[PDB]
């Protein structure tokens, strides 16, 4: 299902977005990246909801670590398997990192805000 051929691509396509080897990319380019990937790991646009729902952990500045991505991206392909548990070990062997939120936590915030902002208009305009 997966090969070093595929892991060459990921690290090739990654350098484009993070040549400085920060081991991070901003959240707002995760959609772009997911698309620039090749098969099988690629997640073609529209892929917003897919990525959100991976519930990737984000450090500050809304940045996401290389490995956090690689794991969720391969999980999507291989599923929650034992062959995959083994893979999680191997390539995980091949810095400051304090996650403070997730993409699912971030999405709940945006939905909450949407709700609250829309409530405001409604609460007022049903008071003549």
């Amino acid at each position: 299902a997966l090969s070093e051929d595929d892991f060459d691509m990921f690290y090739e396509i990654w350098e484009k977005f993070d040549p400085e080897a920060t081991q991070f990319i901003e959240y707002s380019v995760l959609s772009d990246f997911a698309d620039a990937l090749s098969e099988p790991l690629r997640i073609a646009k529209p892929n917003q909801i897919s990525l959100i729902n991976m519930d990737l952990p984000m450090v500050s500045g809304d940045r996401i670590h290389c490995m956090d991505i690689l794991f969720a991206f391969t999980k999507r392909v291989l599923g929650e398997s034992g062959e995959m548990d083994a893979l999680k070990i191997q390539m995980e062997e091949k810095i400051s990192y304090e996650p403070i939120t997730t993409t699912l936590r971030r999405k709940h915030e945006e939905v909450s805000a949407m709700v609250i902002q829309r409530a405001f208009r409604r609460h007022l305009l049903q008071r003549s």
């Binding site: 707002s28 999405k107 709700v115």
Partner: protein, 147 residues
């Protein structure tokens, strides 16, 4: 919105410039009228005011590029609203049963950087629950969002 990529910010600048022919960085009602008359529409002087007024955020009688950007982004979030709403229901409706429970509100809703109370979620339902099943389906959810 500051979710705008550079390409898009430039896109909107192309149009801001169409109007702002004196390059002073604001659009006057006059400059608005000029573009429109060039494109074959002849609106009133009052029509031009109201058009400037709706976008003017500071009441200085004209439109700078920040004010323009705000209006233009607001119009992009308009074309997605129907879906953005749908995809927000699916965020609350995690069991997928097409009904939103108190529990499902409680689980997602945040305000003043903390959870809501059981009493707060209860009323949110009570306000929206037209049919009275103590749950919120799409149609009820829509009416409570749309304007």
């Amino acid at each position: 919105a500051d979710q705008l990529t550079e390409e898009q910010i430039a896109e909107f600048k192309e149009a801001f410039s169409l109007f702002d022919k004196d390059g002073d960085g604001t659009i006057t009602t006059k400059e608005l009228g000029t573009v429109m008359r060039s494109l074959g529409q002849n609106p009133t002087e009052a029509e031009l005011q109201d058009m400037i007024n709706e976008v003017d955020a500071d009441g200085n009688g004209t439109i700078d590029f920040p004010e323009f950007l705000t209006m233009m982004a607001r119009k992009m979030k308009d074309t997605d609203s129907e879906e953005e709403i749908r995809e927000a229901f699916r965020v609350f409706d995690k069991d997928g049963n097409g009904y939103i429970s108190a529990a499902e509100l409680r689980h997602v809703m945040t305000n003043l950087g903390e959870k809501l109370t059981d009493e707060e979620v209860d009323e949110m339902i009570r306000e929206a629950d037209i049919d009275g099943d103590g749950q919120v389906n799409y149609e009820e959810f829509v009416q409570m969002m749309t304007a």
